[PDB]
Amino acid sequence: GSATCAVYGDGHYLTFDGQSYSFNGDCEYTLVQNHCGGKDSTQDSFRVVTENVPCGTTGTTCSKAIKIFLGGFELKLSHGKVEVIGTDESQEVPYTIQQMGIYLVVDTDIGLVLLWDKKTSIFINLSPEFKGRVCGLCGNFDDIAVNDFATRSRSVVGDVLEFGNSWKLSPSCPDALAPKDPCTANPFRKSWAQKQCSILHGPTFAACHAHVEPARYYEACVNDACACDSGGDCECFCTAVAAYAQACHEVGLCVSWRTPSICPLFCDYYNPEGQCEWHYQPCGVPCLRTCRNPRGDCLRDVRGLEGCYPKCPPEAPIFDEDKMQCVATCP
Amino acid sequence: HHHHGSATCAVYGDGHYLTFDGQSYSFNGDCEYTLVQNHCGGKDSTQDSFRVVTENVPCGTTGTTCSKAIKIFLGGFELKLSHGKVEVIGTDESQEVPYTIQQMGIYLVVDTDIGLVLLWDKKTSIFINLSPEFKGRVCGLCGNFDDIAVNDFATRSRSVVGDVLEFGNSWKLSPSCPDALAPKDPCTANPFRKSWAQKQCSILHGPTFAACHAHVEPARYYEACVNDACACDSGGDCECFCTAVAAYAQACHEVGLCVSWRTPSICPLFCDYYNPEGQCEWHYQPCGVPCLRTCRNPRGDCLRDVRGLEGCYPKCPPEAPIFDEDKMQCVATCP
Amino acid sequence: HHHHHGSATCAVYGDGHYLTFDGQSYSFNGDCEYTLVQNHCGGKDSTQDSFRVVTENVPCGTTGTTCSKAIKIFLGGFELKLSHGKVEVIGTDESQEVPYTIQQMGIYLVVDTDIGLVLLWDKKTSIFINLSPEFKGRVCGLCGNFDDIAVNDFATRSRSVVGDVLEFGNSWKLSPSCPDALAPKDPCTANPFRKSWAQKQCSILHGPTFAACHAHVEPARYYEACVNDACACDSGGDCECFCTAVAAYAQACHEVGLCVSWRTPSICPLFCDYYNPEGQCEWHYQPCGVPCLRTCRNPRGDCLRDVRGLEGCYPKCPPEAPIFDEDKMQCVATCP
Amino acid sequence: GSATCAVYGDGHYLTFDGQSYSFNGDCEYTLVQNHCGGKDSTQDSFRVVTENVPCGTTGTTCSKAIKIFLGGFELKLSHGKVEVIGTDESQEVPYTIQQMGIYLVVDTDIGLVLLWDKKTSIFINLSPEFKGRVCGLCGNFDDIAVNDFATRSRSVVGDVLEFGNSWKLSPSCPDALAPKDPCTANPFRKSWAQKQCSILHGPTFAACHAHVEPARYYEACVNDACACDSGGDCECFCTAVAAYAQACHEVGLCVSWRTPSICPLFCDYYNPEGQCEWHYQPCGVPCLRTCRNPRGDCLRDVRGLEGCYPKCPPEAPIFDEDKMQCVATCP
Ligand SMILES: [Ca+2]
Ligand SMILES: [Ca+2]
Ligand SMILES: [Ca+2]
Ligand SMILES: [Ca+2]
């Protein structure tokens, strides 16, 4: 059905076709190109652009900002803040911004939806219609995995570094280079990294191990924890584990991996004084009664979510999107 | 506000000590060091042994150690605190238990019957709250408890020594263990972490602790936060920062002022995890619940002695209000 | 706000008995005003805020003795006058926060000041003064100079020691126009017929119930005080005279730490059940005096208990609603 | 209906037929004698005599101990206790002693009821069966007020002193003399006496002022307060006020006046710790089931028994006449 491309952590990319690799560079790159070859007709113009900056001793880079071109609308994402720098006289809002759980989801009627975590991880979900007519970091969107290493031109080069360098926004940004092992660079952190990422091999994800392999995710976790010594290693570990959790939720499984000791949430903070209406749902609550989407409306899309959700009481059951409360009716 | 007649020794982070009389200093050394002793030798004025010892261990590549295991020997009993669990190594023939273990909030409250109550968070920090009864009878790393700060460096030799390192090594336990040295500058050792350290520790200068800024200074605590963040380069810097800020938070709450600082962005708490399915009995309390009806406290009795028991507590409904001291639930009654 | 645990006690009760902070005791009387406690000691200003207390003493019988009728407090421009169990506020500027916190406690109208001084009033010629140690060696007046020595008292307003109690009182009197005082005849000699009744009433001091305090506080001086105050007081209400005389010794015993339950339905009774809500029994006599309560002014967790020994009727809140609603006379579960 | 005499304070009297006066003298006086002529009259003889010992330096006598004789049964009463001396194993003990309220009450099957407050005050209740048959200081019960002051040998004189001296018992006791003014003797106490006894004119007795005049009771209060100079004027003041309250409650009016300011009680003292079963009942408790008092015995004994009362909780509702507790059932 709908495809999925994942970008997270220290240059970890998952193509639409399932291919994975690593690539880091202090430059802007296009995760997906709509008008591959400038086919402006019979299609809606859109783009997804990521901004990377080095975030460690080894020089590896991580995503910091997300800029999306969308039919004459340009949106800027940075530290959980959505910004608009592009609009059109049509006055219609093609995109909808929602805060479902920890994720900040933007959906457009054209069939595209981005599951952008507020910190550093971005997920792309595309309708099957755009199969075979998009290209870029996320792949060419067909059933064949090998051909996805195609440059900005139609030429196919097997070098991961060459493929990454080809899709740079401007020649001004420097060419990327193959990174050394952060674990080798900082062997002292290796033991702590292994102990932290051992949860991926723990009993918590044993159920998901059947449908999704943890090996690549395990080495990604340990490498990221070895790196990002400049601060917030807990953030790196949390992002890696959250990426694995979202991958598990892709197939439909649901695991409550979060504990008060590791990567905990603060659902009680959003809770109103005295009144309790918030809980953490590992699977996510689909089709909750909001102002825009009351119980009359519903959508089984964006499968796979987690975080704090408002347990609306039966009285005043419709959630207030802009007031963060449960109300009987909405404006 | 201004207070007199109570004291509490504070040890947290990497060698950050706060004596009973208010002295603050840094220290290091992979050894065991006595914390407090009342007998001050063979002289026992109808008291108990009352000896608290702490074992250190280097954490990080900068040669800076942090507290990992804490043993409290009292009346022959030996209780070891490590890996977040209370362990008892020796039980005396006196069937009367001289200590009570309660998980009040995040802290692992250890309260004794002789007016001594401990405060362990299972993570490289400890607060030794002491009754004013033992005033002037305290020999150890937490000062003389004579309400004088300068003489707290009398060392085990009982001669005042200017060097904090000499003081600590005099109070050291194992002769075979190596002597301490001057700690290296952490931020100088790891320059790249300085910006992140400042960004994290800026919370102390932020508006959240505006009320505490008037009463308790944040400068030393901010310096400790920056130092620990710079030094914690062997993983788990988030825990270092959380403990550093929590020390100042508890110090502010000790004077009586209530301050809420935890946010989902910084040092979050996940007490909804303990919440039974569809109950929401637990909630967040900055000052903590002063007292509640537990299995071990079925009466509405309230000690109300220690201050600022941070964490999340269960707001039991009026039906079945007495809490379960063992099964973590709001039950109708206890055995 | 926060007050230190250390304290010193000065007491005055009945027909003009006094108890200095140092421990010195002396009998005195006079129809004048007297600065019991002086902060600046004659205009010598310091960093600490200036405060001063004074009492109005009127004749209280036909033997010439005087008992403290009205208590006047001066601190930071604020003037508090106490009379007939009420509190008169005269000096008050709203540009500054009120420094005192009046709060009824047992049979005492506890008025607390943020400086470090708390005052206890019995509404019947009885005053208890508690002072923070930070004022040691700085205060002066009838309550003493607050040092370890006791015989070095009788420090006149002229910063001189005269030794004679009468001359000390005359020099530390306030009103210049008011006449000189003098030790009068023995009231028991004046009214010998009441001597037997006085002995019968005050025998409780030598009674078995005070044997525990006998080893800590010598009742002999208190016995003489009780006998003398039972004598005179001929203008009516001798029961109040005897009750406050006994209560002085009881409070002195409570200051040591010992607890005595001396009140019986026959001698100095208290009508605790009067304050009890209809069909409910929460008020109960507490000889010790409960150190702290759960109120709106004092929240559930707050238990500031610097002062001890406040005997009186006290509401024992039910466990379901342990928080007491002061000024509402009920126990609840929350405060606004 | 049933007659009622009363004696209280310094020789203040109120006959059954409403005559009110004052008297004094340190001598035994026959309050009530069942035989006017002293003959058998085909009826057992009951005789009640008190001793008005001097009370106060001013020279006014007041009752201290009260002696009661009937059929060889003597119950010396003093110091708040019953001291039975005279008794007869024949027939059956014709008296039961109870302590309802503050009052100590002894009742006889013949219809004569005595109320004692243990402090210089006595109240008599007599059935109408004895009307026109009794003689004593309390006056002959014949519904006539003028025919009172009946001296011995059935003679009437206008001198209260001579009437009392005729009814005197001790041959050698001194003759009574006209009382002086205690307030004139002690003008200093007069201000306090007036201020304290002004409670009678206060609003708390407004509901009873119309039914019974307070002027005589106020005069008695002020005179006794002036007279009381040996220590304990509170006692005589409380006795006067309680006498007026009992006179009011005899009519049926229900008045509550006890407050910690004036004449306080100590009901809590009887209450055991954690057992607040005792309470103050100014109006009296008509129905009780204390031990000998049968369970569910909601009948009437006397009206106006003001005092602390042990309100029994519903469980174990039988109060203990000797233990001061609520038991299930006394033997
Ligand atoms: Ca492909
Ligand atoms: Ca010291
Ligand atoms: Ca002195
Ligand atoms: Ca008649």
Numbering used by the authors:
A (entry chain A), D (entry chain C): 899 to 1229
B (entry chain B): 895 to 1229
C (entry chain D): 894 to 1229
From the study:
The two gel-forming mucins MUC5AC and MUC5B constitute the main structural components of the mucus protecting the underlying epithelia in the respiratory system. The VWD assemblies are formed by the VWD domain, C8, trypsin inhibitor like (TIL) and E domains, except the VWD’ domain that only has the TIL and E domains. We determined the cryoEM structures of the wild type D3 assembly of the human MUC5AC mucin and the structural single nucleotide polymorphisms (SNP) variants Arg996Gln and Arg1201Trp that affect intermolecular interactions. The D3 assembly forms covalent dimers that can appear in two alternative conformations, open and closed, where the closed conformation dimers interact through an arginine-rich loop in the TIL3 domain to form tetramers.
Similarly, the structure of the tetrameric 6xHis-MUC5AC-D3 Arg996Gln assembly was solved at low resolution (6–7 Å), not enough to reveal the molecular mechanism of the non-covalent oligomerization. Surprisingly, the 6xHis-MUC5AC-D3 Arg996Gln adopts another conformation not observed in the other variants as the protein forms ring shape octamers. The His-tagged Arg996Gln mutant showed a high proportion of octameric particles in cryoEM that were essential for solving the high-resolution structure of the non-covalent interaction. Particle subtraction followed by local refinement let us solve the structure of a tetramer forming part of the octamer at 3.69 Å resolution. The MUC5AC-D3 non-covalent tetramer interaction is driven by the TIL3 domain and involves an interface area of 385.4 Å2. The interaction between the MUC5AC-TIL3 domains occurs in the arginine-rich loop β1-β2 stabilized by a disulfide bond between Cys1185-Cys1196. Intermolecular salt bridges and hydrogen bonds are formed between lateral chains of Asp1199-chainB (Asp1199B) and Arg1198-chainD (Arg1198D), and between Arg1198B lateral chain and the main chain of Arg1193D and Asp1195D, Arg1193D and Cys1185B, and between Arg1198D and Leu1197B and Arg1198B. The comparison between the tetrameric MUC5AC-D3 Arg996Gln assembly and the free closed conformation dimer shows significant differences only in the TIL3 domain region. While the tetramer chain D shows only minor deviations, the TIL3 loop β1-β2 in chain B changes its relative position with C8-3 and VWD3 domains allowing the interaction with chain D. No interactions between the His-tag of one monomer and the core of the other one were observed, just His-tag–His-tag interactions, supporting that it is an unspecific interaction that stabilizes the TIL3-TIL3 interface.
